[PDB]
């Protein structure tokens, strides 16, 4: 407990932490019910909802789009304007590269942010508040509830989609979500940097206004049951920068507490 307070002070930041060992139900919590802008971590839950609504076959449906659909960060989507991309390809881009237009196209396919909210409430998430598209969802002022969640809610929702208990997705679809998250390219300095070598990691990162820096993950020991955790952080000033080391260090504290 005092370890997390010490970390907060070292990085001039505020932490929100929740971790659950699914094998023992042992938990690690630090401000687990405090709201933070969820930022791109929402992309994992958006895909979870997409997977509840579409068959594996239906993920092969090609989605056409134009340059008018592109936003501020389109690493993959900008390359396929001419042909379009399948729902499978869009989910890959959104999760592995944090492609913003890919998230927006998926969000439109599932009915928009209000539909994502309804589907999250249906799985029992009464806290996550989807409201906006990318990148405007990153513009959260402290005190606002729009486009925010908590460490506890994000772990609960991530666990619901990714794991067999409480299996909100069938096995084949869970496998897809886990595979994409395991092959994420954006989180090497976050949760991945705080877990021991040999443990497998499936994560989704996010960064937003007020120096918000987040990472949510499912982590596996070489042998045994997974840990689901969320490490969220923010700062007092609008134009504050973040340090990935805060997340990596907070992950190290969590792992000590769990082992």
């Amino acid at each position, epitope marked *: 407990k005092d370890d997390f307070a010490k970390l907060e002070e070292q990085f001039d930041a505020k932490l929100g932490i929740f971790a659950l060992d699914t094998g023992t139900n042992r938990t690690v919590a630090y401000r687990p019910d405090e709201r933070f802008a969820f930022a791109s971590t929402i992309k994992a839950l958006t895909v979870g909802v997409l997977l509840q609504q579409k068959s594996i076959e239906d993920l092969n449906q090609r989605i056409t789009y*134009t*340059r*008018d*659909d*592109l*936003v*501020n960060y389109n690493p993959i989507t900008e390359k396929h304007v001419d042909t379009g991309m399948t729902l499978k390809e869009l989910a890959d881009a959104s999760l592995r590269y944090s492609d913003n*237009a890919a998230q*927006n196209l998926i969000l*439109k396919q599932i009915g928009g942010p209000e539909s994502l909210k309804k589907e999250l409430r249906k799985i029992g998430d009464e806290v996550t508040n989807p409201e906006r*598209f*990318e*990148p*405007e969802l990153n*513009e959260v002022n402290p005190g606002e509830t729009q486009d925010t969640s908590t460490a506890r809610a994000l772990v609960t929702s991530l666990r619901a989609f990714a794991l067999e208990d409480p299996g909100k997705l069938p096995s084949e679809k869970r496998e897809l979500l886990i595979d994409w998250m395991k092959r994420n390219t954006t989180g090497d300095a976050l949760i991945r940097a705080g877990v021991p070598d040999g443990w497998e990691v499936a994560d989704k990162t996010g960064a937003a206004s007020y120096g918000t820096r987040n990472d949510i993950a499912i982590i596996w020991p070489p042998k045994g049951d997974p840990v689901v955790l969320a490490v969220l952080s923010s700062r007092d000033k609008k134009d504050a920068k973040y340090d990935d080391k805060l997340i990596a260090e907070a992950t190290k504290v969590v792992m000590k507490a769990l082992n």
Partner: nanobody
Amino acid sequence: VQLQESGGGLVQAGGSLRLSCAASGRTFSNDHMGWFRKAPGKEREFVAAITPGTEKTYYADSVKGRFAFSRDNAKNTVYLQMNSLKPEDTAVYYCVATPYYRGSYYAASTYTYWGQGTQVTV
């Protein structure tokens, strides 16, 4: 119905321009307004966006701190005050509108009402 943009043209680096977007045919007071720009050769990019109620403003990083989006519901006009103009700001400025939030403010496909555009030179 039409959206006509004025206040653009010949200006020096570091100077200021106030772009005016005059509406006609219908009231645009309940509409989510915005600005987009297109430079010769360079791709069309988002500039600014404003909501109808609370009037929340959204600006591109490339324009943030220098530009200011403001409304005038009575005159059926929206304004874009551009300060500390850079050679980078040289483009054709388009006034955009949508009655509802159908997508991202940064996405051109989100706007159902488009203007003819006004030339801005630095």
